[PDB]
Design a protein around this motif. Structure first.
Motif, PDB file in Angstrom:
ATOM      1  N   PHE B 118       0.848  -1.185   0.000  1.00 16.76           N
ATOM      2  CA  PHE B 118       0.000   0.000   0.000  1.00 16.76           C
ATOM      3  C   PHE B 118       0.886   1.237   0.000  1.00 16.76           C
ATOM      4  CE2 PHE B 118      -2.783  -3.256   1.814  1.00 16.76           C
ATOM      5  CZ  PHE B 118      -3.926  -3.078   1.053  1.00 16.76           C
ATOM      6  N   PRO B 119       0.806   2.085  -1.022  1.00 13.46           N
ATOM      7  CA  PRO B 119       1.602   3.314  -1.042  1.00 13.46           C
ATOM      8  C   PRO B 119       1.092   4.304  -0.011  1.00 13.46           C
ATOM      9  CG  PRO B 119       0.071   3.300  -2.870  1.00 13.46           C
ATOM     10  CD  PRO B 119      -0.036   1.949  -2.222  1.00 13.46           C
ATOM     11  N   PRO B 120       1.861   5.349   0.293  1.00  9.57           N
ATOM     12  CA  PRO B 120       1.369   6.365   1.231  1.00  9.57           C
ATOM     13  C   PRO B 120       0.282   7.218   0.596  1.00  9.57           C
ATOM     14  CG  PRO B 120       3.781   6.414   1.010  1.00  9.57           C
ATOM     15  CD  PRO B 120       3.244   5.620  -0.130  1.00  9.57           C
ATOM     16  N   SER B 121      -0.732   7.541   1.392  1.00  8.17           N
ATOM     17  CA  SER B 121      -1.791   8.428   0.938  1.00  8.17           C
ATOM     18  C   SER B 121      -1.266   9.852   0.794  1.00  8.17           C
ATOM     19  CB  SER B 121      -2.964   8.403   1.917  1.00  8.17           C
ATOM     20  OG  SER B 121      -2.614   9.031   3.138  1.00  8.17           O
ATOM     21  N   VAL B 150      14.026  -0.042  -1.002  1.00  9.35           N
ATOM     22  CA  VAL B 150      13.649   1.026  -1.917  1.00  9.35           C
ATOM     23  C   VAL B 150      14.858   1.326  -2.799  1.00  9.35           C
ATOM     24  CG1 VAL B 150      14.073   2.627  -0.025  1.00  9.35           C
ATOM     25  CG2 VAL B 150      13.029   3.436  -2.110  1.00  9.35           C
ATOM     26  N   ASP B 151      14.643   1.281  -4.117  1.00  8.19           N
ATOM     27  CA  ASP B 151      15.713   1.271  -5.124  1.00  8.19           C
ATOM     28  C   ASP B 151      16.643   0.077  -4.923  1.00  8.19           C
ATOM     29  OD1 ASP B 151      14.483   3.647  -5.769  1.00  8.19           O
ATOM     30  OD2 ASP B 151      16.078   4.912  -4.943  1.00  8.19           O
ATOM     31  N   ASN B 152      16.054  -1.066  -4.563  1.00 14.34           N
ATOM     32  CA  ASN B 152      16.761  -2.326  -4.325  1.00 14.34           C
ATOM     33  C   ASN B 152      17.760  -2.230  -3.175  1.00 14.34           C
ATOM     34  OD1 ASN B 152      15.966  -4.682  -5.836  1.00 14.34           O
ATOM     35  ND2 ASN B 152      16.589  -3.610  -7.707  1.00 14.34           N
ATOM     36  N   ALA B 153      17.602  -1.236  -2.304  1.00 12.34           N
ATOM     37  CA  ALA B 153      18.486  -1.034  -1.161  1.00 12.34           C
ATOM     38  C   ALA B 153      17.761  -1.502   0.096  1.00 12.34           C
ATOM     39  CB  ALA B 153      18.906   0.430  -1.045  1.00 12.34           C
ATOM     40  N   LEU B 154      18.179  -2.653   0.625  1.00 14.84           N
ATOM     41  CA  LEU B 154      17.563  -3.242   1.808  1.00 14.84           C
ATOM     42  C   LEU B 154      17.609  -2.275   2.982  1.00 14.84           C
ATOM     43  CD1 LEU B 154      19.631  -6.449   1.265  1.00 14.84           C
ATOM     44  CD2 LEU B 154      17.126  -6.577   1.232  1.00 14.84           C
ATOM     45  N   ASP B 185      12.463  12.531   2.212  1.00 15.81           N
ATOM     46  CA  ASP B 185      13.265  11.389   1.799  1.00 15.81           C
ATOM     47  C   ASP B 185      12.454  10.325   1.074  1.00 15.81           C
ATOM     48  OD1 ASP B 185      15.921  11.189   4.327  1.00 15.81           O
ATOM     49  OD2 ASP B 185      15.028  12.895   3.271  1.00 15.81           O
ATOM     50  N   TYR B 186      11.128  10.322   1.235  1.00 17.16           N
ATOM     51  CA  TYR B 186      10.291   9.440   0.430  1.00 17.16           C
ATOM     52  C   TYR B 186      10.264   9.880  -1.028  1.00 17.16           C
ATOM     53  CZ  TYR B 186       5.939   7.639  -1.620  1.00 17.16           C
ATOM     54  OH  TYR B 186       5.001   7.080  -2.458  1.00 17.16           O
ATOM     55  N   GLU B 187      10.360  11.187  -1.283  1.00 13.99           N
ATOM     56  CA  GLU B 187      10.345  11.680  -2.654  1.00 13.99           C
ATOM     57  C   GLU B 187      11.674  11.454  -3.360  1.00 13.99           C
ATOM     58  OE1 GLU B 187       7.516  12.509  -3.726  1.00 13.99           O
ATOM     59  OE2 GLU B 187       6.484  12.681  -1.799  1.00 13.99           O
ATOM     60  N   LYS B 188      12.777  11.398  -2.612  1.00 14.72           N
ATOM     61  CA  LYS B 188      14.096  11.183  -3.198  1.00 14.72           C
ATOM     62  C   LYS B 188      14.245   9.816  -3.849  1.00 14.72           C
ATOM     63  CE  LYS B 188      16.429  14.192   0.164  1.00 14.72           C
ATOM     64  NZ  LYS B 188      15.886  15.311  -0.654  1.00 14.72           N
ATOM     65  N   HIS B 189      13.234   8.956  -3.765  1.00 11.55           N
ATOM     66  CA  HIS B 189      13.316   7.593  -4.264  1.00 11.55           C
ATOM     67  C   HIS B 189      12.052   7.268  -5.050  1.00 11.55           C
ATOM     68  CE1 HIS B 189      16.520   7.686  -1.390  1.00 11.55           C
ATOM     69  NE2 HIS B 189      16.793   6.397  -1.478  1.00 11.55           N
ATOM     70  N   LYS B 190      12.141   6.245  -5.904  1.00  6.00           N
ATOM     71  CA  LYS B 190      11.059   5.924  -6.830  1.00  6.00           C
ATOM     72  C   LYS B 190      10.461   4.544  -6.609  1.00  6.00           C
ATOM     73  CE  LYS B 190       8.982   7.849 -10.574  1.00  6.00           C
ATOM     74  NZ  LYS B 190       8.748   9.297 -10.859  1.00  6.00           N
ATOM     75  N   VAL B 191      11.285   3.508  -6.476  1.00  4.74           N
ATOM     76  CA  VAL B 191      10.818   2.124  -6.450  1.00  4.74           C
ATOM     77  C   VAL B 191      10.740   1.645  -5.007  1.00  4.74           C
ATOM     78  CG1 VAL B 191      11.377  -0.248  -7.073  1.00  4.74           C
ATOM     79  CG2 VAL B 191      11.650   1.591  -8.743  1.00  4.74           C
ATOM     80  N   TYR B 192       9.572   1.145  -4.603  1.00  6.31           N
ATOM     81  CA  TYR B 192       9.325   0.723  -3.228  1.00  6.31           C
ATOM     82  C   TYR B 192       8.760  -0.691  -3.228  1.00  6.31           C
ATOM     83  CZ  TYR B 192      10.011   5.571  -1.779  1.00  6.31           C
ATOM     84  OH  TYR B 192      10.543   6.815  -1.536  1.00  6.31           O
ATOM     85  N   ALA B 193       9.388  -1.596  -2.473  1.00  3.70           N
ATOM     86  CA  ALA B 193       9.054  -3.013  -2.557  1.00  3.70           C
ATOM     87  C   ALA B 193       9.158  -3.670  -1.188  1.00  3.70           C
ATOM     88  CB  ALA B 193       9.986  -3.737  -3.537  1.00  3.70           C
ATOM     89  N   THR B 206       7.653 -10.599  -4.314  1.00  2.00           N
ATOM     90  CA  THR B 206       7.958  -9.177  -4.190  1.00  2.00           C
ATOM     91  C   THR B 206       6.818  -8.359  -4.784  1.00  2.00           C
ATOM     92  OG1 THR B 206      10.267  -9.819  -4.553  1.00  2.00           O
ATOM     93  CG2 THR B 206       9.767  -7.468  -4.443  1.00  2.00           C
ATOM     94  N   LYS B 207       6.038  -7.708  -3.924  1.00  2.00           N
ATOM     95  CA  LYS B 207       5.036  -6.738  -4.351  1.00  2.00           C
ATOM     96  C   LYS B 207       5.632  -5.340  -4.246  1.00  2.00           C
ATOM     97  CE  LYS B 207       1.878  -9.816  -5.139  1.00  2.00           C
ATOM     98  NZ  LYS B 207       1.630 -10.256  -6.547  1.00  2.00           N
ATOM     99  N   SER B 208       5.463  -4.536  -5.294  1.00  3.40           N
ATOM    100  CA  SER B 208       6.124  -3.242  -5.349  1.00  3.40           C
ATOM    101  C   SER B 208       5.274  -2.244  -6.119  1.00  3.40           C
ATOM    102  CB  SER B 208       7.508  -3.353  -5.992  1.00  3.40           C
ATOM    103  OG  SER B 208       8.232  -2.145  -5.834  1.00  3.40           O
ATOM    104  N   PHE B 209       5.624  -0.970  -5.957  1.00  5.51           N
ATOM    105  CA  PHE B 209       4.995   0.129  -6.674  1.00  5.51           C
ATOM    106  C   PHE B 209       6.037   1.213  -6.902  1.00  5.51           C
ATOM    107  CE2 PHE B 209       4.734   3.355  -3.365  1.00  5.51           C
ATOM    108  CZ  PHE B 209       4.827   2.608  -2.207  1.00  5.51           C
ATOM    109  N   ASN B 210       5.816   2.024  -7.931  1.00  2.00           N
ATOM    110  CA  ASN B 210       6.663   3.175  -8.205  1.00  2.00           C
ATOM    111  C   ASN B 210       5.981   4.439  -7.704  1.00  2.00           C
ATOM    112  OD1 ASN B 210       8.083   1.189  -9.576  1.00  2.00           O
ATOM    113  ND2 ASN B 210       7.261   1.801 -11.578  1.00  2.00           N
TER     114      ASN B 210
END
Lengths: 248, 212, 222
Positions: B118-121, B150-154, B185-193, B206-210
């Motif tokens: 679930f992405p942030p509202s 996020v961005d494949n960074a654990l 810092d949430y905006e500084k990144h794109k891919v969230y998984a 792996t469920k993810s969203f951009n």
């Protein structure tokens, strides 16, 4: 001196000895009881004494012989309601009345007395408490065994009272004169009365509440309007009782 | 006070099995021993009182035995609905005391979790904080590994987990893992998984969203 | 039928006071002993205090013997627990219980209330924020979609969450609250529905946080 009262119960020595043997044979007991020694301690209290000069110390060897380890938190006192109090202990068999102990079982519904200069038992007549003298063998015994009974009580004591009597609590009865005044406050926290038919507001019950409270023991009171129903649910608490405890 | 010791702390059985629960008193209570069932979030339910008497409406599969110090509760035909903590309680003297409890958990076939992210509202992003939620739903056993990158960074130490108690009908578990970021810092990144590892899965799911 | 309903309780400062209530029906309150039993979070049951049917006789646990007072108003069928000098270790769910025995004594409890949480804390009350967890459009297992509400940053517990004013119960999971490092609780409440019902069914979460008087209804749209 010795008259005006009924005499010693016929076959009184055999009866006491027989009752002790039967009580011990249905109660593998705290300490083995030599019933002969018990009868000797009984006899020594009143035999060859003035039946108007009996003291509590006369009965102490019998009391020591007859001390029992009774669960002290399970004592049901009662005053002038005999049958329902004892039938209650036949059902709630983890609770005891004075007559359920060895010493109460021995003397229940008996009379006895001796004569001053002889070693005989007077089967003809015995001192009546009211019209001859108070310190007679029977009255002194019950006044002694009831005091020690109350002294053993602990944690919560219940007393059954007859709400049909005009004096639900009588300060001059054994429960009022001896037992209530001898509950040890360091051992007894609460005395809960069960008035049998709201009579907890009766002047005599509030008198019992006052007397008990000034000895620093809590007082509790409970009306019982349906005695037969109250007993039916002591037997089997699993039918219809959590809604029927009401004023009938 | 009288100490009541229940063994074991946990008991994991399968439905239809026989549950044997022990309570051992530090001194004799002699019969004055009750048994209580407490399902999650609920008040206790009296099962057995005075060590052997079933309370009204208690099913016949519940039975109490014992006297003195050793007492036992038996549940003959266990059900998934019986997942609860059971307490023993003595009324021999004051104070009345309860045991620490035995938790009966129901065994089950392995069930893989359904994974949802679930992405942030946008409503929360105005507050200056963003929260990503990964849902792991209806799985067994409870052993599961959720991994945030996020961005494949654990990511490390920026998430909290919460597990349901075992479902009383299908005996499954559900888990939530909430990742908390700064909005800046949430905006500084794109891919969230979120990465989910479980015994019922062939490969980590792996469920993810951009972002956006 | 028998009913025990506790009221009061919530957040109270260390050293402060709190009075609990237990309203009853379905039995003759006068002729039964009552007790309070408490449950610290994630702990067992601990008996607190007992009172006779008429009120005169009382017993207390040693840990509360100087600070708690049990009482009852039988004319209102209400049981009370007057708690003074509250400490952190008194934080617990507090049940009222009815004695099954027909007289005063060592109790066994056949009826219980639902319990009410007492939190003893230095921290202030905080009302939650309610954020939607919107259903996906790039996942959603098969024809199963997940959605929910995020109930964040409240103190103290508890909070109550329902869906569609209670009409939707199947498939609902409200997770246990977790204490964030800020000292504030947070949880999510989720529900799985058929994915193809997202355009025809309206889903609303009802959040109630009694300590702060926050009642939020959040509609969750895809």
């Amino acid at each position: 001196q010795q008259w005006s009262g009924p005499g010693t119960t016929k076959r009184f020595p055999e009866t006491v000895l027989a009752r002790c043997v039967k009580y011990t044979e249905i109660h593998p007991e705290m300490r083995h009881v030599d019933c002969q020694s018990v009868w000797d301690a009984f006899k020594g209290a009143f035999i060859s004494k003035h039946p108007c000069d009996i003291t509590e110390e006369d009965y102490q060897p019998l009391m020591k012989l007859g001390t029992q380890t009774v669960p002290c938190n399970k004592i049901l006192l009662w005053s002038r309601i005999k049958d329902l109090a004892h039938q209650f202990t036949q059902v709630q068999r983890d609770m005891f009345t004075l007559e359920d102990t060895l010493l109460g079982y021995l003397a229940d519904d008996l009379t006895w007395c001796g004569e001053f200069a002889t070693s005989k038992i007077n089967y003809q007549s015995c001192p009546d408490w009211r019209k001859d003298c108070s310190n007679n063998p029977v009255s002194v015994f019950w006044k002694t065994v009831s005091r020690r009974f109350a002294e053993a009580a602990c944690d919560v004591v219940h007393v059954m009272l007859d709400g049909s009597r005009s004096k639900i609590f009588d300060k001059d009865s054994t429960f009022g004169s001896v037992e209530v005044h001898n509950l040890q406050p360091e051992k007894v926290q609460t005395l809960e009365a069960w008035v049998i038919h709201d009579l907890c507001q009766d002047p005599t019950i509030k008198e019992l509440e006052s007397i008990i409270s000034k000895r620093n023991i809590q007082f509790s009171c409970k009306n019982i309007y349906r005695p037969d129903k109250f007993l039916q649910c002591v037997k089997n608490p699993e039918d219809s009782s959590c809604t029927s405890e009401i004023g009938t | 006070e009288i100490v009541l010791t229940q063994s074991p702390a946990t008991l994991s059985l399968s439905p239809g099995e026989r549950a044997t629960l022990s309570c051992r008193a530090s001194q004799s209570v002699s019969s004055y021993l009750a048994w209580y069932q407490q399902k999650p979030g609920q008040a206790p339910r009296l099962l057995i009182y005075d060590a052997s008497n079933r309370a009204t409406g208690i099913p016949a599969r519940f039975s109490g035995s014992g006297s003195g110090t050793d007492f036992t509760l038996t549940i003959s035909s266990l059900e998934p609905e019986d997942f609860a903590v059971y307490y023993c309680q003595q009324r021999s003297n004051w104070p009345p005391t309860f045991g620490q409890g035995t938790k009966v958990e129901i065994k089950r076939t392995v069930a893989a979790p359904s994974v949802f992210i679930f992405p942030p509202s946008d409503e929360q992003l105005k507050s200056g904080t963003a929260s990503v939620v990964c849902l792991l739903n209806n799985f067994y056993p409870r052993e599961a590994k959720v991994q945030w990158k996020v961005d494949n960074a654990l990511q490390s130490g920026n998430s909290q987990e919460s597990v349901t108690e075992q479902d009383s009908k299908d005996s499954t578990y559900s888990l939530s893992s909430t990742l908390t970021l700064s909005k800046a810092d949430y905006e500084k990144h794109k891919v969230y998984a979120c990465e989910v590892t479980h015994q019922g899965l062939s490969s980590p799911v792996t469920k993810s969203f951009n972002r956006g | 039928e028998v009913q025990l309903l506790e009221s009061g309780g919530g957040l109270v400062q260390p050293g402060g006071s709190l009075r609990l209530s237990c309203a009853v029906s379905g039995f003759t309150f006068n002729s039964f002993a009552m007790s309070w039993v408490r449950q610290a979070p994630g702990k067992g049951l601990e008996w607190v205090s007992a009172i006779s049917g008429s009120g005169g006789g009382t017993y207390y646990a040693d840990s509360v013997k100087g600070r708690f007072t049990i009482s009852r108003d039988n004319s209102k069928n209400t049981l009370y627990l007057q708690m003074n000098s509250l400490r952190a270790e008194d934080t617990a769910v507090y049940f009222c219980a009815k004695d099954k025995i027909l007289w005063f004594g060592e109790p066994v409890f056949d009826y219980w209330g639902q319990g009410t949480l007492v939190t003893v804390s230095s921290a202030s009350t905080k009302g939650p924020s309610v954020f939607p967890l919107a259903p996906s459009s790039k996942s959603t297992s098969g024809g199963t979609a997940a959605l929910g509400c995020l109930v964040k940053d409240y103190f103290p517990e508890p909070v109550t969450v329902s869906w569609n004013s209670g009409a939707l119960t199947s498939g609902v999971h409200t997770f246990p609250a977790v204490l964030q490092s800020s000292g504030l609780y947070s949880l999510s409440s989720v529900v799985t529905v058929p994915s193809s019902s997202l355009g025809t069914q309206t889903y609303i979460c009802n959040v109630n946080h009694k300590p702060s008087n926050t009642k939020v209804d959040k509609k969750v749209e895809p």
